[PDB]
Every structure is written in C-alpha cells, then in structure tokens.
From Swiss-Prot, chain A:
Name of the protein in its database record: Integrator complex subunit 10
Localization terms from the record: Nucleus
Subunit structure: Component of the Integrator complex, composed of core subunits INTS1, INTS2, INTS3, INTS4, INTS5, INTS6, INTS7, INTS8, INTS9/RC74, INTS10, INTS11/CPSF3L, INTS12, INTS13, INTS14 and INTS15. The core complex associates with protein phosphatase 2A subunits PPP2CA and PPP2R1A, to form the Integrator-PP2A (INTAC) complex. INTS10 is part of the tail subcomplex, composed of INTS10, INTS13, INTS14 and INTS15.
Gene name tied to this protein: INTS10
Function summary: Component of the integrator complex, a multiprotein complex that terminates RNA polymerase II (Pol II) transcription in the promoter-proximal region of genes.
Family: Belongs to the Integrator subunit 10 family.
Coiled-coil features, chain-numbered ranges: none
UniProtKB/Swiss-Prot annotation, chain B:
Name of the protein in its database record: Integrator complex subunit 5
Family, per entry: Belongs to the Integrator subunit 5 family.
Localization in the cell: Nucleus; Cytoplasm; Nucleus membrane
Subunit structure and binding partners: Component of the Integrator complex, composed of core subunits INTS1, INTS2, INTS3, INTS4, INTS5, INTS6, INTS7, INTS8, INTS9/RC74, INTS10, INTS11/CPSF3L, INTS12, INTS13, INTS14 and INTS15. The core complex associates with protein phosphatase 2A subunits PPP2CA and PPP2R1A, to form the Integrator-PP2A (INTAC) complex.
Protein's organism: Homo sapiens
Record function comment: Component of the integrator complex, a multiprotein complex that terminates RNA polymerase II (Pol II) transcription in the promoter-proximal region of genes.
UniProtKB/Swiss-Prot annotation, chain C:
One GO term (biological process): eye development
Gene: INTS15
Quaternary structure and interacting proteins, as annotated: Component of the Integrator complex, composed of core subunits INTS1, INTS2, INTS3, INTS4, INTS5, INTS6, INTS7, INTS8, INTS9/RC74, INTS10, INTS11/CPSF3L, INTS12, INTS13, INTS14 and INTS15. The core complex associates with protein phosphatase 2A subunits PPP2CA and PPP2R1A, to form the Integrator-PP2A (INTAC) complex. INTS15 is part of the tail subcomplex, composed of INTS10, INTS13, INTS14 and INTS15.
Recorded family membership: Belongs to the Integrator subunit 15 family.
A cellular component annotation (GO) from this entry: integrator complex
Annotated compartments: Nucleus; Chromosome
Keywords of the record: Chromosome, Nucleus
Source organism of this protein record: Homo sapiens (Human)
Protein name: Integrator complex subunit 15
Function summary: Component of the integrator complex, a multiprotein complex that terminates RNA polymerase II (Pol II) transcription in the promoter-proximal region of genes.
Length: 254, 265, 372
C-alpha cells in the first residue's frame, strides 16, 4: 500500500529469488508508489544489464531516468569506450563479436549522452582526445563550450611531442581525426598563420611517421592499431595544405 | 499437423465432392483416404464423410481380396496397413476421443462385410461348426487381421480408461448381425475368456427366458473359445441355484461345452 | 423458417448449402448493416439446422438427404459461402446458435451444428466469424461461449495432434477470437482434471497470445470502459489473477483432489504463470496512461475472491507440508497481480480496496508485504 520499507524488502526478496521466480521481479520493479524508485536500482537494472533483447530497450529508456535522478553510473560508458578500440579485430571469432555487441548494444545517442559526463571529467589526455573525437563524430558542429581550441590543443601537443617515431596514441589520433575536423569546421575563427603552422606540424609528424620504422597491417607492438594508423601521410598533408591555402583567402607530375 | 487456414476449403471440396477439381480427375481411393486422414488431423468436424469413405475403401479391399482368394487392378492391401498405422497413432496419442468412434465404425463395417459375404458367397464357411475355418480363412484377407489389431489397441485403450460399453456394443452387433459376424465375438472371447463368456451366458439366459438360434451360436462360440475356462459357467449356475436351465440346454446342444461337465459333475 | 429450410434443403450435393446461404443473405442483407453482431436470426436458424444438423424446423423431422457425407458436403459448401460472403450476418446466423440461446425446440442440434460450423469457419479462415466471436460473449451467456470455445480448442489441439499450430496462426490472424478465448481458457483451467493443466501446445498458444493477443486486449479496453462485474460476459481477456492462482496452485489443488500431471509440471506451470504475469504487466503498462477508468482497478470482478477461496479450501488439507510452496506462490501471484494492476493508476486506493478484498486472503509473507 504505502509501506515503502516493506516494498523495498519485497523487492530484495524478489531479487533473492530472481533466478527462479521471474514473475515477482516484473511485479516488484514495475510496482508504482512507495519505494518504487529506490527499488529501481537493481531490479530494473538487472533487466537492463541482461544480455537478452531487454538491454536494447530497457537500458536505453530506464537507465536514462536513473542517470537523470542520480548520474553515478559511468562504468558502462567507459567499458563501451574501451571495448570499441579493441572491437576492430577477431570479427570472425564469436566471442569477440559477442563482447563488441554487448558493449555496443545500448543506443549510440544514449551512450554518447551518458559518456558526456566522463568526457567533461576526462582528465587523461588519451581519454579526453577519445571523448573529443567521439563528440565530433556524433555531432560535427558540437562546438559550444570550447571548439576553437580543440584543434589548437591537439596541434600543440603534437608539436611538443617532437617524436620521429609516431608511437604516441593521443598525438597520432588527434592528427588523424581532429585536424580534418578542424579543417572542415569553419565556425571557429582563427588566424591563417596558426592553421598553416598546425598543418605544417601535422605534415612533419606524418613524414616522420612514414620515414621511421613502424612496429602486414596490424597494431603496433606498444600502440593500438586505430591510434597509430596514418593513411597516406604525404597525400593527406598535401590535401590539408591545399585546404588551408583555400581557406586562407586563396610519378613525374611536379 | 499444421496447415494454412485458407487451403481447407479447396481440400475439403476436393475430398467430399469425390472429383478433385485442382487436378481435374477422380482420384483413386488411396489418395482420397490419405486426404481424409489429413483432414482428420486438421479438421475434426470434417469426420462425417471420412468414416464413410473408409468404409468404402475397406469394403472394396475385402472384395478384391475375395476375388483373389474365393476364386482360387491387383489387391489394394498395401494402403490398409498405412490406415492401421495412422489410426493407431490417433488412438495411442489420445485414447479419449479416438477409442469409441473408431471402434464403432470398425465393428459396424465388420458387421457389413459379414452380412455381405456370407451366404452370397457359398465358399465362405458359415457359423455352423466351421468356426475354426472362419478364424483361419478370414486372415487370408489382411483387412480382417488389421481390424482385429485395431481392436487390440482400442480394447487396451478402453481397459485403460473404462472397459464397460465395448462388450455391450459387441453383443448388440452380434444380435443384429447374426449369425455371420459372431466369429469375431468368438475370437474376442478367446482373447478375454472371463468377461466375454460371462456376458455370453447372460445374453443366452435372456434369450432362453424370453423364448421360454443366436443363443446356440453364442454357446458354440463360447465352447470353442473356453479352454479350461468354464468355471465361470459353474459359478453362474451356483449363483442361480442360490437365488436358469439355459446352461443345461446349451450343454445339450454343445457337447464340447459339456466335455468339462463330467469333471464339474 | 420451416418453408425456406425445406426449399433450401434439396440438392445436398454442394447445392443445398449454396441455396440456403443465398436465401439467408437475401433475408439478412439489411441485417448485415443494421447490426451484424454475433446473434442468431430465427428465420435462418431453421435453414442452418436443416442444411447442417440434418434437422429441420421440427426436431423429429426427416434429415436432409442421408446426412453424414451429404451433411459434410453441405457444411463445407456453407463454410465456403460464409467465408466468401463478405458479410458478418450470414456467419453470425450460422455460428451464433452454438452458445447464444435461441429458444427453439431443435436448438440443441442447431447449437451442435453451429459449433461445428464455427470450428470449420475458424479453420477455413472466415475472419468475420472469428471477429464476431469476441462480440458473442459481450452480451450473450459467457459460460456457454466459454464451453463452446474450450470444446473447439480441445478438438483442435487435444483431439487433433499438431493442428494446434494452425489454431494459433488463426488466433494471430484473428486477434478478436484470441482475446475472447482467454475467458474460455480461464474457465477450462480450474485444475480439476488433467485436461485443465495446459499442454505444451497450450503453452505455445499462450505464448502466442501473450505476444499478439495483448494488442487485441488493449484495443477492446479502448473500445469500451473497463466495467466492474459486467452483466453476464465482458470478454475483456483479463482473467490473469485467476489463471495465475490456478496454475501456481495446480501442484497443490490437483494433488489435494490428473494430480500427477500438475505435480510433475510444477516448473512448466510456474513458467506459464510467470509468462502470463509478464503479459498482464505489459498490458497494464500499455493501459496505464490510457483512459482505462478507475473504480474496478485490478481486473478481478470477484474472481480474485473465488481464486482466494479455492486456494484456501485446499490450503488446510495436505497443503501445509506437501505443497505449502505452491499455495504461497499462488497467494503471492494474486497479490502481485493486484499490486501491478494498481501500479497502472486504475486502482486509486493503496489500502482501501486492499482492505476490502485482500484482508480475507490466505496467509502469505510475500502477499501480506505486497498488500501492505
């Protein structure tokens, strides 16, 4: 009726017999009034965390309410982000595909919204760069808090690194992703000299990566495949320089 | 088995009308029988013509077998065992809805064949002391054996559920289809001596009491079947004396039944 | 009509039924638009009895042709005509006499013929007959309709092995019939016999209903307000509490007074009860913001009290040691259904209606906690 403590006790008892008596689980997690929201922490989450079809809808609709009421569950977003980097291999194997699907079973928009909290508090350079890349990929025009300095910070980090071998995950990933986004994003107003310097630094880093010894196409012995990958260094640098020149007020080929 | 809900109208039209419209010809009895079995699987209310078509199939098969034997396309016996398998599958899958109706249809068609091919066929041994010849000859026609196997299944199902009315129906048919079908009752009594000989004694006593030769045939059949199983007759006589001479008349007409009378004496 | 029945009965070889259907359509052409509900017209009742039951307007009259094969052919032709009639009047006239009383001397044979014809029509994909079958229990007797539907279901599944899948497919294609069959299933699930315990095919049909018939239940709930203890039959397809109480107490009530079938199927009965509870909770969630009305709240209409009484009757004899868990599960399931129903906002009383009804319920820790 109105005995919220009794409702919580009944929810706990149903959780105890959850593996056998599934009817009480549904009747308790969907029991309105009393300690309903208090019981919607392990009862509803059990359906949300299930590997069945429940995670497709329950996690994308019921976990959002819990996050709004209490945004303290960032483990799922971090696990999905970690698994995303390692999900680009062993596609033929069933276990890797199952793990990748379990990580990505949640909605993309909901996952990005949940991981925005970790993105704001992403003190780690690699974590912050990955969060910025994910935000840019989800929304190319998502520049409200700080969009002008997104490319600037990446270019500064790449220049300060000054490594002939591009083994740095954050710098290489930033040069690969943020630089094309910075070139495409004309909303942020910056001097042409800064863009030219950033393009020159990216070109130097790409040339150094191409000339230096790497570590078949596979991940490096020390860095992830996605982070250290550079596709067509000289050609990409030339394209970036041409784009910058266009935006700066205008074999034996050459 | 499952079927689409729309195909039933055309399938039932094909079966009941006799002429198959989707193929544009009269199918043989085998395909019609298979279609009727499928209809029984799908549509229970569609059983009305299925039993009649089964009766026709069995009658034609018995006629063909008689032509092959009493004078001694080809015999259609090969579809009979298929019908046996399908009906036994219904019986063992569900005894409740299949045991009484199948047994009644079967015993009625045995009565039909007994009336049809006795006297009209002179070589068929009548129930006039040729009872053993009746039991031997009719298994030459595979349909009869098949039906007795069906009855083993049906009677086992009734024994499982309620073995009360089968014997009553059997005796009613024996009275109606007298005296040519009663060899089946004799074989049944051979399988189950006690209850059947008791009911034979009962009906014979009714016949004698009302009269003062179906009872004579029943007594002859009982005497043929009762191999050291006449103790029921002695118990009935003792009960009748406790609180009637039809047994005496039966023994007079049946010396074999009186073979154990001296030992009982 | 005796004269029309006699005129239409001639030429039983696929012509008598066609003539009877034509005459019925001509007579009830206006009735098809005025009120094509599942009702039996007395004009065509005699024709339906004569051409299907082999019994004219007089009960002891001469049967049409020789019946049997001719009767079967007439039934097939009538089913083909009714399914292709594109009007609910003919199908309703043919089939509605099975359970809805007609006040006729030959009404028993007419009812048997109507039941056979309705079973054939459902199997012959006659959507109007199945759709009207839901409306049949809305105003006619519910016990007779439940018995007829249960007999048809048993013939389809129990008597016919493997045809239950066809019945489930038809119920999916005719959700009105599937929703109307919930009351029949509840009536046939009294746990008083072996047939009362659902089989594997029955479990599959229940799963199909939970997946699809819930939409029909929601549509019916939107069609008219949820009434508390409606006249003689509502056919709302909301007998969840009674069915759950019977299924959970099947290994207890059945064992108290067949018993082995319900006792060995404790896991299957529990799974079926859980599935039914999940379906009911989903339906309540769907019909929560919708105008499902108050007053009644939980869908009981005093059936929860009968289920509690049935559980309590067996709860004192042999239940406390052998099957106390089953009785506790039944009480908990009933209380959980009542609470989940109140969670949709229909029951506007945390403990008023609970004190009115659940106070007399048996002793159970889970049920007492849920109630309070």
């Amino acid at each position: 009726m109105s005995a919220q403590g009794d409702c919580e006790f009944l929810v706990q008892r149903a959780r105890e017999l959850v593996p056998q008596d599934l009817w009480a689980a549904k009747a308790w997690l969907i029991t309105a009034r009393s300690l309903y929201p208090a019981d919607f922490n392990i009862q509803y989450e059990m359906y949300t965390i299930e590997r069945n079809a429940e995670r497709t809808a329950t996690a994308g609709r019921l976990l959002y309410d819990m996050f709004v009421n209490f945004p303290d569950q960032p483990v799922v977003w971090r696990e999905i982000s970690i698994i995303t980097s390692a999900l680009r291999n062993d596609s033929q194997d069933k276990q890797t595909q199952f793990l990748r699907s379990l990580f990505e079973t949640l909605p993309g928009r909901v996952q990005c919204e949940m991981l925005l909290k970790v993105t704001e508090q992403c003190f780690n350079t690699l974590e912050r760069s990955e969060m910025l890349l994910l935000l840019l990929r989800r929304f190319p025009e998502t520049v409200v808090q700080h969009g002008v300095g997104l490319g600037e910070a990446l270019l500064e980090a790449e220049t300060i690194e000054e490594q002939e071998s591009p083994v740095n995950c954050f710098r290489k990933l930033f040069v690969c992703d943020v630089l094309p986004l910075i070139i495409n994003n004309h909303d942020v107003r910056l001097p042409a000299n800064l863009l030219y310097k950033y393009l020159n630094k990216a070109a130097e880093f790409y040339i150094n990566y191409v000339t230096r010894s790497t570590q078949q196409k596979y991940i490096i012995e020390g860095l992830t495949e996605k982070s250290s990958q550079i596709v067509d260094p000289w050609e990409r640098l030339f394209k970036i320089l041409n784009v910058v020149g266009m935006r700066c007020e205008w074999y034996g080929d050459i | 088995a499952p079927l689409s809900a729309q195909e039933l109208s055309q399938e039932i039209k094909a079966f009941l009308t006799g002429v198959d419209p989707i193929l544009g010809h009269q199918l043989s009895a085998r395909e019609h029988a298979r279609c009727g079995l499928l209809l029984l699987r799908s549509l229970p209310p569609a059983r009305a013509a299925v039993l009649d078509h089964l009766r026709g199939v069995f009658d034609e098969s018995v006629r063909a077998h008689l032509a092959a034997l009493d004078e001694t396309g080809p015999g259609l016996e090969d579809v009979v065992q298929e019908v046996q398998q399908v009906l036994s599958e219904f019986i063992r899958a569900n005894p409740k809805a299949w045991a009484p109706v199948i047994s009644a249809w079967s015993i009625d068609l045995m009565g039909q064949l007994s009336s049809t091919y006795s006297g009209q066929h002179q070589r068929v041994p009548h129930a006039t002391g040729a009872l053993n010849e009746l039991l031997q000859l009719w298994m030459g026609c595979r349909a009869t054996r098949t039906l007795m196997d069906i009855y083993v299944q049906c009677l086992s199902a009734l024994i499982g559920s309620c073995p009360d009315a089968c014997v009553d129906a059997l005796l009613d048919t024996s009275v109606q289809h007298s005296p040519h079908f009663d060899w089946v009752v004799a074989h049944i009594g051979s399988s189950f001596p006690g209850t059947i000989i008791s009911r034979v004694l009962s009906c014979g006593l009714k016949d004698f009491c009302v009269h003062g030769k179906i009872a004579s045939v029943v007594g002859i059949l009982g005497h043929l079947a009762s191999r050291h199983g006449d103790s029921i007759r002695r118990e009935l006589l003792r009960m009748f004396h406790d609180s009637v001479p039809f047994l005496l008349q039966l023994a007079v007409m049946s010396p074999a039944l009186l073979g154990t009378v001296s030992g009982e004496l | 009509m005796s004269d029309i029945r006699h005129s239409l009965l001639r030429r039983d070889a696929l012509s008598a039924a066609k003539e009877v259907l034509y005459h019925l359509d001509i007579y009830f052409s206006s009735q098809l638009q005025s009120a094509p509900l599942p009702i039996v017209d007395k004009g065509p009742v005699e024709l339906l009895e004569e051409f299907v039951f082999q019994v004219p307007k007089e009960r002891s009259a001469q049967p049409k042709r020789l019946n049997s094969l001719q009767e079967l052919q007439l039934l097939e032709i009538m089913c083909n005509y009714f399914q292709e009639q594109t009007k609910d009047s003919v199908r309703q006239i043919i089939f509605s006499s099975l359970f809805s009383p007609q006040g006729n001397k030959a009404d028993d044979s007419r009812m048997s013929l109507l039941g056979k014809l309705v079973s054939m029509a459902v199997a012959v994909c006659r959507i109007p007959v199945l759709e009207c079958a839901a409306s049949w229990l809305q105003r006619t007797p519910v016990v007779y309709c439940v018995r007829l539907a249960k007999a048809l279901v048993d013939d389809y599944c129990c008597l016919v092995p493997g045809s239950i899948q066809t019945l489930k497919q038809i119920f999916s294609a005719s959700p009105r019939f599937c929703c109307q069959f919930i009351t029949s299933v509840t009536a046939l699930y009294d746990l008083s016999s072996d047939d009362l315990i659902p089989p594997m095919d029955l479990l599959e049909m229940i799963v199909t209903w939970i997946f699809e018939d819930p939409r029909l239940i929601l549509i019916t709930f939107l069609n008219t307000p949820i009434a508390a203890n409606l006249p003689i039959g509502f056919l709302e397809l909301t007998p969840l509490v009674g069915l759950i109480r019977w299924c959970v107490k099947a290994p207890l009530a059945y064992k108290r007074k067949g018993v082995g079938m319900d006792r060995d199927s404790h896991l299957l009965y529990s799974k079926l009860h859980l599935s039914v509870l999940q379906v009911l909770m989903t339906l309540q969630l769907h019909l929560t913001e919708k105008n499902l009305y108050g007053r009644l709240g939980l869908i009981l209409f005093d059936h929860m009290v009968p289920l509690v009484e049935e559980i309590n009757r067996l709860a004192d004899e042999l239940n406390p040691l052998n099957a106390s868990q089953e009785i506790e599960l039944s009480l908990d399931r009933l209380a959980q259904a009542l609470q989940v129903a109140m969670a949709s906002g229909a029951l506007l009383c945390t403990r008023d209606d609970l004190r009115t009804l659940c106070s007399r319920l048996p002793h159970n820790n889970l049920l007492q906690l849920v109630i309070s």
